[PDB]
Structure formats: C-alpha cells, structure tokens
Short mmCIF file of C-alpha atoms and ligand atoms in Angstrom, two decimals:
data_model
loop_
_atom_site.label_atom_id
_atom_site.label_comp_id
_atom_site.label_asym_id
_atom_site.label_seq_id
_atom_site.Cartn_x
_atom_site.Cartn_y
_atom_site.Cartn_z
CA UNK N 1 68.71 97.29 86.86
CA UNK N 2 70.30 95.33 84.02
CA UNK N 3 73.98 96.23 83.86
CA UNK N 4 75.82 97.29 80.74
CA UNK N 5 78.78 95.32 79.42
CA UNK N 6 82.41 96.40 79.61
CA UNK N 7 83.93 95.86 76.18
CA UNK N 8 87.59 96.49 75.50
CA UNK N 9 89.37 96.76 72.17
CA UNK N 10 93.07 95.84 72.14
CA UNK N 11 95.77 95.38 69.51
CA UNK N 12 99.01 96.83 68.20
CA UNK N 13 99.43 100.31 66.73
CA UNK N 14 97.23 100.86 63.67
CA UNK N 15 95.17 97.72 64.33
CA UNK N 16 92.02 99.85 63.95
CA UNK N 17 91.11 100.18 67.64
CA UNK N 18 90.03 103.80 67.60
CA UNK N 19 88.10 103.47 64.34
CA UNK N 20 86.32 100.34 65.50
CA UNK N 21 85.59 101.68 68.98
CA UNK N 22 83.92 104.77 67.54
CA UNK N 23 81.94 102.77 65.00
CA UNK N 24 80.87 100.20 67.60
CA UNK N 25 79.45 102.88 69.90
CA UNK N 26 77.64 104.47 66.96
CA UNK N 27 76.13 101.16 65.84
CA UNK N 28 75.08 100.04 69.34
CA UNK N 29 73.37 103.37 69.98
CA UNK N 30 71.66 103.18 66.59
CA UNK N 31 70.35 99.77 67.65
CA UNK N 32 68.78 101.13 70.84
CA UNK N 33 71.55 100.34 73.31
CA UNK N 34 72.91 102.92 75.70
CA UNK N 35 76.64 102.69 74.87
CA UNK N 36 79.43 105.17 75.51
CA UNK N 37 83.05 105.45 74.42
CA UNK N 38 86.07 105.53 76.69
CA UNK N 39 89.80 105.29 76.01
CA UNK N 40 93.10 104.76 77.82
CA UNK N 41 95.19 106.65 78.26
CA UNK N 42 92.53 109.21 79.20
CA UNK N 43 94.69 112.22 78.37
CA UNK N 44 92.42 114.88 79.85
CA UNK N 45 93.17 114.37 83.55
CA UNK N 46 96.21 115.63 85.44
CA UNK N 47 97.79 112.18 85.19
CA UNK N 48 96.61 111.96 81.57
CA UNK N 49 98.53 115.12 80.69
CA UNK N 50 101.69 113.67 82.21
CA UNK N 51 101.17 110.57 80.09
CA UNK N 52 100.46 112.56 76.94
CA UNK N 53 103.59 114.66 77.42
CA UNK N 54 105.61 111.47 77.89
CA UNK N 55 104.19 109.82 74.77
CA UNK N 56 104.84 112.97 72.74
CA UNK N 57 108.47 112.91 73.92
CA UNK N 58 107.99 116.33 75.52
CA UNK N 59 109.13 114.76 78.76
CA UNK N 60 110.96 111.69 79.94
CA UNK N 61 109.45 109.62 82.72
CA UNK N 62 111.13 106.79 84.59
CA UNK N 63 109.74 103.51 83.22
CA UNK N 64 108.25 102.18 86.43
CA UNK N 65 106.70 105.53 87.23
CA UNK N 66 105.07 105.80 83.82
CA UNK N 67 103.75 102.23 84.08
CA UNK N 68 102.13 103.16 87.40
CA UNK N 69 100.72 106.40 85.99
CA UNK N 70 99.07 104.46 83.15
CA UNK N 71 97.42 102.25 85.78
CA UNK N 72 96.46 105.15 88.01
CA UNK N 73 94.88 106.70 84.91
CA UNK N 74 92.54 103.69 84.73
CA UNK N 75 91.79 103.63 88.46
CA UNK N 76 90.72 107.27 88.46
CA UNK N 77 87.94 106.33 86.05
CA UNK N 78 86.82 103.26 88.02
CA UNK N 79 84.07 104.97 90.03
CA UNK N 80 82.64 106.34 86.75
CA UNK N 81 82.94 102.99 84.98
CA UNK N 82 81.18 101.17 87.79
CA UNK N 83 78.41 103.73 87.99
CA UNK N 84 77.79 103.73 84.24
CA UNK N 85 77.73 99.95 83.97
CA UNK N 86 75.37 99.71 86.93
CA UNK N 87 73.08 102.26 85.25
CA UNK N 88 72.87 99.95 82.23
CA UNK N 89 75.32 101.74 79.98
CA UNK N 90 77.64 99.57 77.91
CA UNK N 91 81.16 100.96 77.78
CA UNK N 92 83.36 100.47 74.72
CA UNK N 93 86.98 101.08 75.74
CA UNK N 94 89.87 101.79 73.36
CA UNK N 95 92.70 100.06 75.22
CA UNK N 96 92.85 98.99 78.84
CA UNK N 97 95.16 97.17 81.24
CA UNK N 98 96.24 94.75 78.51
CA UNK N 99 97.95 97.53 76.59
CA UNK N 100 99.42 98.69 79.91
CA UNK N 101 101.14 95.32 80.45
CA UNK N 102 102.07 94.67 76.84
CA UNK N 103 103.74 98.05 76.22
CA UNK N 104 105.73 98.21 79.45
CA UNK N 105 106.47 94.47 79.01
CA UNK N 106 108.22 95.39 75.77
CA UNK N 107 110.91 96.98 77.93
CA UNK N 108 113.58 94.61 79.25
CA UNK N 109 113.52 93.73 82.93
CA UNK N 110 109.75 94.29 83.29
CA UNK N 111 108.14 90.96 84.22
CA UNK N 112 104.56 90.28 83.15
CA UNK N 113 103.69 89.71 86.82
CA UNK N 114 105.02 93.06 88.05
CA UNK N 115 103.30 94.84 85.17
CA UNK N 116 99.93 93.29 85.94
CA UNK N 117 99.84 94.05 89.65
CA UNK N 118 98.77 97.72 89.68
CA UNK N 119 95.76 96.82 87.56
CA UNK N 120 94.77 93.85 89.67
CA UNK N 121 91.21 94.54 90.81
CA UNK N 122 90.07 96.85 88.00
CA UNK N 123 86.62 96.17 86.57
CA UNK N 124 87.01 93.00 84.49
CA UNK N 125 85.91 93.36 80.87
CA UNK N 126 83.04 91.19 79.75
CA UNK N 127 84.67 91.00 76.33
CA UNK N 128 88.19 91.74 75.13
CA UNK N 129 88.41 92.06 71.38
CA UNK N 130 91.93 91.64 70.04
CA UNK N 131 92.16 93.25 66.60
CA UNK N 132 94.64 90.83 65.11
CA UNK N 133 96.73 91.57 62.09
CA UNK N 134 100.30 91.14 60.95
CA UNK N 135 102.52 94.07 61.95
CA UNK N 136 103.61 94.16 58.30
CA UNK N 137 99.99 94.77 57.27
CA UNK N 138 99.53 97.39 59.96
CA UNK N 139 102.69 99.05 58.63
CA UNK N 140 100.94 99.64 55.29
CA UNK N 141 98.40 101.91 56.96
CA UNK N 142 100.36 105.07 56.29
CA UNK N 143 103.42 105.88 58.40
CA UNK N 144 104.27 105.50 62.06
CA UNK N 145 103.39 108.52 64.18
CA UNK N 146 106.04 110.34 66.21
CA UNK N 147 105.03 109.22 69.69
CA UNK N 148 107.07 106.92 71.85
CA UNK N 149 106.61 103.23 71.03
CA UNK N 150 105.67 104.06 67.43
CA UNK N 151 108.37 102.01 65.77
CA UNK N 152 108.66 98.45 64.50
CA UNK N 153 110.84 96.95 67.21
CA UNK N 154 108.69 98.21 70.06
CA UNK N 155 105.45 97.06 68.41
CA UNK N 156 106.90 93.61 67.74
CA UNK N 157 107.87 93.27 71.40
CA UNK N 158 104.47 94.54 72.55
CA UNK N 159 102.69 92.06 70.28
CA UNK N 160 104.68 89.18 71.75
CA UNK N 161 103.57 90.38 75.21
CA UNK N 162 99.96 90.52 74.07
CA UNK N 163 100.36 86.89 72.89
CA UNK N 164 101.53 85.96 76.39
CA UNK N 165 98.51 87.67 77.95
CA UNK N 166 96.12 85.89 75.63
CA UNK N 167 96.97 82.70 77.51
CA UNK N 168 94.80 83.92 80.40
CA UNK N 169 91.56 81.98 79.97
CA UNK N 170 90.09 83.94 82.88
CA UNK N 171 89.18 86.52 80.26
CA UNK N 172 86.69 86.44 77.42
CA UNK N 173 89.18 87.20 74.65
CA UNK N 174 87.86 87.17 71.08
CA UNK N 175 90.17 87.36 68.09
CA UNK N 176 89.05 89.69 65.31
CA UNK N 177 90.59 89.55 61.84
CA UNK N 178 91.55 93.21 61.69
CA UNK N 179 93.08 92.88 58.23
CA UNK N 180 89.66 93.13 56.58
CA UNK N 181 87.88 96.30 55.54
CA UNK N 182 86.70 98.81 58.12
CA UNK N 183 83.09 97.75 57.55
CA UNK N 184 83.79 94.01 57.64
CA UNK N 185 85.81 94.27 60.85
CA UNK N 186 83.05 96.43 62.27
CA UNK N 187 80.32 93.89 61.59
CA UNK N 188 82.35 91.13 63.24
CA UNK N 189 82.94 93.27 66.32
CA UNK N 190 79.32 94.45 66.44
CA UNK N 191 77.92 90.91 66.43
CA UNK N 192 80.33 89.84 69.17
CA UNK N 193 79.42 92.92 71.15
CA UNK N 194 75.67 92.34 70.94
CA UNK N 195 76.11 88.79 72.24
CA UNK N 196 78.27 90.04 75.10
CA UNK N 197 75.83 92.81 76.06
CA UNK N 198 73.02 90.26 76.37
CA UNK N 199 75.08 87.89 78.53
CA UNK N 200 76.62 90.60 80.73
CA UNK N 201 73.19 91.27 82.25
CA UNK N 202 73.27 87.76 83.74
CA UNK N 203 76.41 87.95 85.90
CA UNK N 204 77.91 90.56 88.19
CA UNK N 205 80.93 92.62 87.26
CA UNK N 206 84.13 90.89 88.32
CA UNK N 207 87.65 92.03 89.19
CA UNK N 208 90.55 91.78 86.77
CA UNK N 209 93.39 89.42 87.58
CA UNK N 210 92.11 88.50 91.02
CA UNK T 1 133.90 102.57 94.98
CA UNK T 2 132.45 101.85 98.43
CA UNK T 3 128.70 102.36 98.27
CA UNK T 4 126.69 104.45 100.68
CA UNK T 5 123.92 102.94 102.79
CA UNK T 6 120.21 103.47 102.24
CA UNK T 7 118.67 104.29 105.60
CA UNK T 8 114.95 104.78 106.04
CA UNK T 9 113.07 106.25 108.97
CA UNK T 10 109.49 105.07 109.47
CA UNK T 11 106.79 105.50 112.10
CA UNK T 12 103.39 107.04 112.75
CA UNK T 13 102.59 110.74 112.61
CA UNK T 14 104.66 112.77 115.09
CA UNK T 15 107.03 109.87 115.78
CA UNK T 16 109.95 112.26 115.15
CA UNK T 17 110.90 111.09 111.65
CA UNK T 18 111.60 114.46 110.12
CA UNK T 19 113.49 115.74 113.17
CA UNK T 20 115.60 112.61 113.41
CA UNK T 21 116.27 112.41 109.68
CA UNK T 22 117.58 115.98 109.63
CA UNK T 23 119.70 115.46 112.73
CA UNK T 24 121.08 112.15 111.45
CA UNK T 25 122.28 113.73 108.20
CA UNK T 26 123.85 116.59 110.14
CA UNK T 27 125.65 114.24 112.53
CA UNK T 28 126.89 111.85 109.82
CA UNK T 29 128.28 114.75 107.78
CA UNK T 30 129.91 116.19 110.89
CA UNK T 31 131.58 112.81 111.35
CA UNK T 32 133.08 112.83 107.85
CA UNK T 33 130.47 110.78 106.01
CA UNK T 34 128.90 111.95 102.78
CA UNK T 35 125.21 111.73 103.71
CA UNK T 36 122.19 113.40 102.14
CA UNK T 37 118.54 113.75 103.09
CA UNK T 38 115.58 112.55 101.07
CA UNK T 39 111.88 112.25 101.87
CA UNK T 40 108.69 110.68 100.54
CA UNK T 41 106.42 111.98 99.38
CA UNK T 42 108.83 114.15 97.38
CA UNK T 43 106.36 116.99 96.90
CA UNK T 44 108.39 118.98 94.38
CA UNK T 45 107.78 116.87 91.27
CA UNK T 46 104.67 116.89 89.09
CA UNK T 47 103.44 113.74 90.82
CA UNK T 48 104.55 115.20 94.16
CA UNK T 49 102.30 118.22 93.66
CA UNK T 50 99.35 115.95 92.97
CA UNK T 51 100.13 114.12 96.20
CA UNK T 52 100.56 117.32 98.18
CA UNK T 53 97.25 118.69 96.93
CA UNK T 54 95.57 115.42 97.90
CA UNK T 55 97.08 115.40 101.40
CA UNK T 56 96.07 119.03 101.91
CA UNK T 57 92.49 118.11 100.95
CA UNK T 58 92.66 120.56 98.03
CA UNK T 59 91.75 117.65 95.80
CA UNK T 60 90.27 114.20 96.08
CA UNK T 61 92.05 111.31 94.40
CA UNK T 62 90.70 107.80 93.95
CA UNK T 63 92.38 105.58 96.56
CA UNK T 64 94.07 103.16 94.19
CA UNK T 65 95.30 106.00 92.00
CA UNK T 66 96.81 107.85 94.94
CA UNK T 67 98.49 104.67 96.19
CA UNK T 68 100.08 104.25 92.76
CA UNK T 69 101.13 107.90 92.62
CA UNK T 70 102.90 107.53 95.98
CA UNK T 71 104.82 104.59 94.51
CA UNK T 72 105.54 106.35 91.23
CA UNK T 73 106.88 109.22 93.34
CA UNK T 74 109.51 106.83 94.73
CA UNK T 75 110.34 105.26 91.36
CA UNK T 76 111.04 108.65 89.79
CA UNK T 77 113.85 109.10 92.31
CA UNK T 78 115.32 105.62 91.80
CA UNK T 79 117.92 106.58 89.20
CA UNK T 80 119.14 109.35 91.55
CA UNK T 81 119.13 107.06 94.58
CA UNK T 82 121.13 104.40 92.78
CA UNK T 83 123.64 106.90 91.44
CA UNK T 84 124.16 108.56 94.82
CA UNK T 85 124.60 105.28 96.67
CA UNK T 86 127.04 104.05 94.05
CA UNK T 87 129.02 107.29 94.43
CA UNK T 88 129.39 106.51 98.14
CA UNK T 89 126.72 108.83 99.47
CA UNK T 90 124.59 107.53 102.32
CA UNK T 91 120.94 108.47 101.93
CA UNK T 92 118.74 109.12 104.95
CA UNK T 93 115.10 108.86 103.85
CA UNK T 94 112.10 110.23 105.76
CA UNK T 95 109.50 107.59 104.89
CA UNK T 96 109.54 105.08 102.07
CA UNK T 97 107.48 102.18 100.72
CA UNK T 98 106.58 101.06 104.24
CA UNK T 99 104.56 104.20 104.83
CA UNK T 100 103.06 103.69 101.37
CA UNK T 101 101.70 100.25 102.36
CA UNK T 102 100.76 101.11 105.92
CA UNK T 103 98.75 104.24 105.08
CA UNK T 104 96.82 102.81 102.13
CA UNK T 105 96.45 99.56 104.14
CA UNK T 106 94.54 101.59 106.72
CA UNK T 107 91.76 101.83 104.15
CA UNK T 108 89.37 98.87 104.02
CA UNK T 109 89.61 96.52 101.07
CA UNK T 110 93.30 97.25 100.42
CA UNK T 111 95.27 94.03 100.96
CA UNK T 112 98.87 94.23 102.13
CA UNK T 113 99.87 92.24 99.03
CA UNK T 114 98.24 94.60 96.52
CA UNK T 115 99.70 97.60 98.34
CA UNK T 116 103.23 96.22 98.22
CA UNK T 117 103.33 95.33 94.54
CA UNK T 118 104.02 98.73 92.93
CA UNK T 119 107.06 99.12 95.17
CA UNK T 120 108.40 95.66 94.50
CA UNK T 121 111.89 96.15 93.09
CA UNK T 122 112.73 99.53 94.62
CA UNK T 123 116.19 99.88 96.13
CA UNK T 124 116.08 97.87 99.37
CA UNK T 125 117.06 99.85 102.47
CA UNK T 126 120.11 98.66 104.34
CA UNK T 127 118.43 99.78 107.55
CA UNK T 128 114.82 100.60 108.40
CA UNK T 129 114.48 102.46 111.66
CA UNK T 130 110.99 102.29 113.13
CA UNK T 131 110.53 105.19 115.56
CA UNK T 132 108.28 103.39 118.00
CA UNK T 133 106.05 105.14 120.46
CA UNK T 134 102.51 104.87 121.76
CA UNK T 135 100.04 106.85 119.66
CA UNK T 136 98.86 108.38 122.95
CA UNK T 137 102.38 109.73 123.54
CA UNK T 138 102.63 110.99 119.98
CA UNK T 139 99.29 112.73 120.55
CA UNK T 140 100.90 114.86 123.28
CA UNK T 141 103.23 116.45 120.75
CA UNK T 142 100.94 119.38 120.05
CA UNK T 143 97.87 118.90 117.87
CA UNK T 144 97.14 116.91 114.74
CA UNK T 145 97.77 118.82 111.51
CA UNK T 146 94.99 119.33 108.97
CA UNK T 147 96.18 116.94 106.27
CA UNK T 148 94.44 113.75 105.34
CA UNK T 149 95.26 110.82 107.64
CA UNK T 150 96.02 113.19 110.52
CA UNK T 151 93.50 111.78 112.96
CA UNK T 152 93.55 109.09 115.62
CA UNK T 153 91.59 106.37 113.86
CA UNK T 154 93.67 106.51 110.69
CA UNK T 155 96.96 106.51 112.61
CA UNK T 156 95.86 103.54 114.71
CA UNK T 157 95.00 101.58 111.57
CA UNK T 158 98.29 102.57 109.91
CA UNK T 159 100.26 101.49 112.98
CA UNK T 160 98.60 98.08 112.92
CA UNK T 161 99.66 97.79 109.26
CA UNK T 162 103.22 98.77 110.14
CA UNK T 163 103.16 95.97 112.76
CA UNK T 164 102.17 93.52 110.02
CA UNK T 165 105.03 94.70 107.81
CA UNK T 166 107.54 94.32 110.61
CA UNK T 167 107.05 90.57 110.29
CA UNK T 168 109.16 90.66 107.11
CA UNK T 169 112.57 89.43 108.25
CA UNK T 170 113.89 90.09 104.75
CA UNK T 171 114.48 93.63 106.00
CA UNK T 172 116.90 95.01 108.55
CA UNK T 173 114.29 96.62 110.78
CA UNK T 174 115.52 98.25 114.00
CA UNK T 175 113.13 99.46 116.67
CA UNK T 176 113.95 102.84 118.18
CA UNK T 177 112.36 104.04 121.41
CA UNK T 178 111.03 107.30 120.01
CA UNK T 179 109.46 108.32 123.32
CA UNK T 180 112.80 109.59 124.62
CA UNK T 181 114.23 113.07 124.17
CA UNK T 182 115.21 114.35 120.75
CA UNK T 183 118.89 114.00 121.64
CA UNK T 184 118.57 110.52 123.16
CA UNK T 185 116.61 109.19 120.19
CA UNK T 186 119.17 110.80 117.93
CA UNK T 187 122.13 109.08 119.56
CA UNK T 188 120.42 105.69 119.28
CA UNK T 189 119.69 106.25 115.61
CA UNK T 190 123.18 107.63 114.91
CA UNK T 191 124.93 104.58 116.39
CA UNK T 192 122.69 102.22 114.43
CA UNK T 193 123.33 104.24 111.30
CA UNK T 194 127.12 104.18 111.65
CA UNK T 195 127.07 100.39 112.00
CA UNK T 196 124.86 100.08 108.93
CA UNK T 197 127.03 102.42 106.82
CA UNK T 198 130.09 100.27 107.56
CA UNK T 199 128.33 97.01 106.66
CA UNK T 200 126.57 98.36 103.55
CA UNK T 201 129.95 98.66 101.81
CA UNK T 202 130.26 94.87 101.97
CA UNK T 203 127.17 93.80 100.00
CA UNK T 204 125.46 95.02 96.85
CA UNK T 205 122.23 96.96 96.89
CA UNK T 206 119.24 94.63 96.73
CA UNK T 207 115.64 94.94 95.55
CA UNK T 208 112.74 95.45 97.90
CA UNK T 209 110.16 92.70 98.24
CA UNK T 210 111.61 90.53 95.49
N1 LIG U 301 90.44 97.95 58.35
C1 LIG U 301 91.23 98.93 58.00
N2 LIG U 301 91.84 98.94 56.80
C2 LIG U 301 92.65 99.92 56.39
N3 LIG U 301 92.97 101.02 57.05
C3 LIG U 301 92.35 100.98 58.22
C4 LIG U 301 91.51 100.05 58.77
N4 LIG U 301 91.08 100.43 60.05
C5 LIG U 301 91.67 101.60 60.28
N5 LIG U 301 92.44 101.98 59.20
C6 LIG U 301 93.30 103.19 59.11
O1 LIG U 301 94.48 102.87 59.77
C7 LIG U 301 94.88 103.95 60.60
C8 LIG U 301 94.88 103.43 62.05
O2 LIG U 301 93.51 103.24 62.46
P1 LIG U 301 93.09 103.50 63.96
O3 LIG U 301 91.65 103.09 64.08
O4 LIG U 301 93.42 104.87 64.40
O5 LIG U 301 93.99 102.38 64.70
P2 LIG U 301 94.56 102.30 66.22
O6 LIG U 301 93.75 103.12 67.15
O7 LIG U 301 94.58 100.85 66.51
O8 LIG U 301 96.01 102.91 66.11
C9 LIG U 301 93.95 105.11 60.32
O9 LIG U 301 94.42 105.86 59.20
C10 LIG U 301 92.67 104.36 59.87
O10 LIG U 301 91.82 105.03 58.98
N1 LIG U 302 111.58 113.10 120.99
C1 LIG U 302 110.69 114.05 120.91
N2 LIG U 302 110.05 114.51 122.01
C2 LIG U 302 109.14 115.48 121.98
N3 LIG U 302 108.72 116.15 120.92
C3 LIG U 302 109.37 115.68 119.86
C4 LIG U 302 110.31 114.70 119.75
N4 LIG U 302 110.73 114.54 118.41
C5 LIG U 302 110.03 115.44 117.72
N5 LIG U 302 109.20 116.16 118.56
C6 LIG U 302 108.23 117.20 118.14
O1 LIG U 302 107.10 116.51 117.70
C7 LIG U 302 106.61 117.09 116.51
C8 LIG U 302 106.69 116.00 115.41
O2 LIG U 302 108.09 115.80 115.10
P1 LIG U 302 108.51 115.44 113.62
O3 LIG U 302 109.99 115.16 113.64
O4 LIG U 302 108.05 116.45 112.64
O5 LIG U 302 107.75 114.03 113.44
P2 LIG U 302 107.22 113.24 112.11
O6 LIG U 302 107.97 113.67 110.91
O7 LIG U 302 107.35 111.81 112.47
O8 LIG U 302 105.72 113.69 111.98
C9 LIG U 302 107.41 118.35 116.24
O9 LIG U 302 106.84 119.44 116.95
C10 LIG U 302 108.75 117.98 116.94
O10 LIG U 302 109.50 119.05 117.45
C1 LIG U 303 96.51 102.36 77.92
C2 LIG U 303 97.96 102.30 77.69
C3 LIG U 303 98.58 102.67 76.54
N1 LIG U 303 99.91 102.58 76.44
C4 LIG U 303 100.38 103.10 75.16
C5 LIG U 303 100.01 102.38 73.87
C6 LIG U 303 100.24 103.50 72.83
O1 LIG U 303 101.58 103.39 72.37
C7 LIG U 303 100.08 104.77 73.62
C8 LIG U 303 99.07 105.79 73.04
O2 LIG U 303 97.85 105.05 72.85
P1 LIG U 303 96.94 105.13 71.55
O3 LIG U 303 97.68 104.38 70.45
O4 LIG U 303 95.70 104.40 71.90
O5 LIG U 303 96.79 106.63 71.18
O6 LIG U 303 99.99 104.43 75.00
C9 LIG U 303 100.85 102.18 77.40
O7 LIG U 303 102.06 102.13 77.25
N2 LIG U 303 100.23 101.82 78.58
C10 LIG U 303 98.87 101.86 78.78
O8 LIG U 303 98.35 101.49 79.99
C1 LIG U 304 105.54 108.13 101.55
C2 LIG U 304 104.10 108.03 101.81
C3 LIG U 304 103.42 108.78 102.71
N1 LIG U 304 102.10 108.62 102.87
C4 LIG U 304 101.56 109.57 103.82
C5 LIG U 304 101.96 109.52 105.29
C6 LIG U 304 101.60 110.94 105.75
O1 LIG U 304 100.27 110.90 106.24
C7 LIG U 304 101.65 111.77 104.49
C8 LIG U 304 102.53 113.02 104.56
O2 LIG U 304 103.83 112.56 105.02
P1 LIG U 304 104.69 113.28 106.14
O3 LIG U 304 104.01 113.01 107.47
O4 LIG U 304 106.01 112.60 106.11
O5 LIG U 304 104.68 114.80 105.83
O6 LIG U 304 101.80 110.88 103.39
C9 LIG U 304 101.23 107.75 102.19
O7 LIG U 304 100.03 107.64 102.38
N2 LIG U 304 101.91 106.98 101.26
C10 LIG U 304 103.26 107.08 101.04
O8 LIG U 304 103.85 106.28 100.08
MG1 LIG U 305 93.98 104.68 68.38
MG1 LIG U 306 107.61 114.52 109.14
MG1 LIG U 307 101.96 88.21 93.62
#
C-alpha cells in the first residue's frame, strides 16, 4: 500500500498555521486524497489537559517537565500516525517537534540539543512548511491571546530558535510567504503538499533527528 | 550554608531499596543530621498518578511517552530538591534516573543514550548506592507483585542495563551487598552515607550526565 505523507505546518503565533492546516486538509480531500488533520499540542489526552492548563496559566509547570510533556504528547500519537500513514492517509499537522524545541528554546539555559532529544525518533515529516512572516505583520492580526508565550519577547526568541532549526538540511523545509492572503498562502501550500504526497509514496517513513 | 548530600538508592525489584531508604533517613536523623526521604516515581502528582495507573496496568501508555513522564516526574521535584539541599537537608532518594534508564532500556529498541537524555541536567547524586544481589535471591523475598515489570525476564533485562550504567565513572557509585540482613545492609549504607554527607559540603551540586 502506498503510504500517505506526513506534512507539518510550523511558524510563530498568528502565522496562519491553523487556518492553513484546515484549508489544506479540505482541499486535499476535495481533490480525492485521503487526508486528515492533527495538531500539537493534542489537548484532549490526559497529558494534553496538563499542557492546556499550563498554557492557559491555570497551572505552573516546571520548564523541563513541560518540555517533556509536550514531547510525550507527540509520542502518544505515534502509533496512530504510523498506522494512518501506512494505510495511505496523508496527515496535515498543525505544529510538531519544531515548535517544541523553538518554544522551550526561547527560555534561557535550554540548549537546542537538550530540547531536541525527547523527540528524537518521532516519525520524520515528509514536508515541513514554515509559514514565514515578520512578527510585526503577525502582530497586526488582532491582539495577542492570553496564553503563555503570547507576547512579543517570547515570540521573537522562539522565531530565532526556529531560524536555528532551519539549518537542519536533513529535513524537507519549505518557506511559505505567510504575509499574503489566506487564499494565496493556501494555494502555495497546496501545490507544495501535492508534490510531497506524490514523492512520499516512493520512500519509507524515516525517524526525526536520528 | 553547608549543603546536604543527594543520596540515591538503586537496584532491582526487592533489592531492599524502600526498606533501606526509610531506615537510612531514620538513622541519619537520630544522629543529628537533617535528612528527608524522597522516592521516584513520586506518585502523588498529576504525572505521578498517570505513572501509577500505568504501573498498576489500569492504563496502557506508549513506551516513549511513559519514559518521558518518568523523567518529567523527577524534573517537577527539582526546585524542591535544590532548595532542600541548599538549606542543608540531606535527601535520601528511593530510585532516580538510573531506574528510569534501566527499566525503559529493558524494552527493545530503546538505546541507553536516548533513555538518558531527558534526565540530562538533573541534580547529580553525591552517592549512588546500588543494592546488589542475585535476582534469584531477590526472588526468595516472597512473590512478585502485580505491577508492570514485576516478572523475571523484565528484571533480568533491567539489571543488565544497570550494569551498563555502572560503567559511568562520572558518578560516585557504591556497591552494597544487599543479600545480607536488613540491619547489616543498613549499617553498610549508613556508614557510606555519613562519609558522603561530610564530603558533599565541600563541592557544589553538579548536573547529571552533562
Ligand atoms: N493570511 C492571513 N492574513 C490575515 N489574517 C490571517 C491570515 N491567516 C490567518 N489570519 C488570521 O490571523 C489569525 C491567526 O490565524 P491562525 O490560522 O489561527 O494562526 P496560528 O494558528 O498560526 O496562530 C486569525 O484571526 C486568522 O483569521
Ligand atoms: N535484607 C533483606 N533480607 C530479606 N528480606 C528483605 C531484606 N530487605 C528487604 N526485605 C524484604 O523484601 C521485600 C522487598 O523489600 P523492599 O525494601 O520493599 O525492596 P524494594 O523497594 O527494592 O522493592 C520486603 O518484604 C522486605 O521486607
Ligand atoms: C507543539 C508545541 C507547542 N508549544 C506551544 C506553542 C504555542 O505557544 C502553544 C499553543 O499552540 P497553538 O498556538 O498551536 O494553539 O504551545 C510548545 O511550547 N511546545 C510544543 O511541543
Ligand atoms: C523511577 C522509575 C521507576 N521505574 C519503575 C521501576 C519499578 O518497576 C516501578 C515502581 O517503582 P518501585 O519499585 O520503586 O515501587 O517504576 C521506571 O520504569 N522508570 C523510572 O524513572
Ligand atoms: Mg493555531
Ligand atoms: Mg520499593
Ligand atoms: Mg547526544
């Protein structure tokens, strides 16, 4: 059976990830692909609830612990991800391990190396779209929410960490100009996704960062 | 202020860790030290409950996720551990990161390296007592419990992983002949502990595996 592709959308807050992930799944399904939507954090699980409470500031969680919970929250979906891909379903994922490293990396004394380790071995995305736009342009998209990390200084530090990660050529990173209109960004992402879905059927799923 | 020592007790199931940890705290306090008892997993926290449910077989947890939860369960106590040690309190800990690596390492496809990473940077123990005894002798101490890992094949594989870890000379590992009587084992551990408490006041707390 021809496997589905694992496509991840990354970027800072308000980059358009959730909008574009939803629209990409809709468009791929309308074009005859079997595509499904996933997101991280997956706030529905027991770990997910801990993470949601933390992000809402309803609880405080030690920084290393929360970093590990974010990773554990990905691992608990790995059996499902592998099964779906093997069944031929393409998975469009709103955030993945890259957000995990970039957001914890925005905290002092968290090396990129330590942050990556827990996620070493996850299913490696076939395509990582980075929805690029200036933080000042993202800032024009209404106001910051009230969750943790939703402030200018944290986003700036997370973006710099994403830039560091984009130096890993082991991954198929594709820059997307996320400053355009919702429909224009969508078309760019959809074309990239269709190419990746066709090529993913030619090579086995690999392991991230290993 | 003269810091307390961080003393960890490790070993296979039924090696006497919990008995000896309790008795060591009692004896140190009776000798005028400020010593407190800790254990991992710390089953009282939100993460701890997840871990307890898993160990009781009330739930299944993906292996990488549970490994990370075990580590997160240590990290969430790090601020407390650091504060207590700095206040001069010696902490006697029933299991730590070594058990975390040895038990997950008993599962195929879990490298020692990947298992160590989440715990890299925890407070480094001043003394790691390994309560050594043949698994066949441990087996004579009543019957195996009903929790996960409480069977001969898993314990054998975990012991082999502990042997691998004991090759790290970066740690002050001390072998204890845990086959002796409760009181004899206790005296050996108590003498080792008193020496370590005196020397811990001379050097700062370090970071594990880094
Ligand atoms: N291309 C775009 N131009 C303008 N506003 C946009 C664009 N894409 C999304 N938005 C709006 O910006 C906000 C953030 O979009 P969202 O998709 O939720 O981003 P993210 O998940 O990256 O935070 C929402 O109000 C959304 O409607
Ligand atoms: N030295 C010893 N000799 C014989 N039985 C022992 C000894 N130490 C502990 N035990 C008994 O063995 C069992 C396991 O001891 P415990 O301290 O709970 O070990 P652990 O925490 O390593 O599983 C308990 O019934 C305990 O009373
Ligand atoms: C997936 C993931 C998200 N995050 C953050 C990024 C966002 O600030 C936050 C909520 O995500 P969201 O913006 O997609 O709703 O979680 C981490 O800190 N680590 C992670 O592993
Ligand atoms: C601390 C720790 C324990 N364990 C295991 C060892 C025991 O089988 C189990 C319950 O511990 P206990 O024997 O000390 O009650 O948890 C792990 O698998 N990982 C860990 O990080
Ligand atoms: Mg979003
Ligand atoms: Mg015990
Ligand atoms: Mg390494």
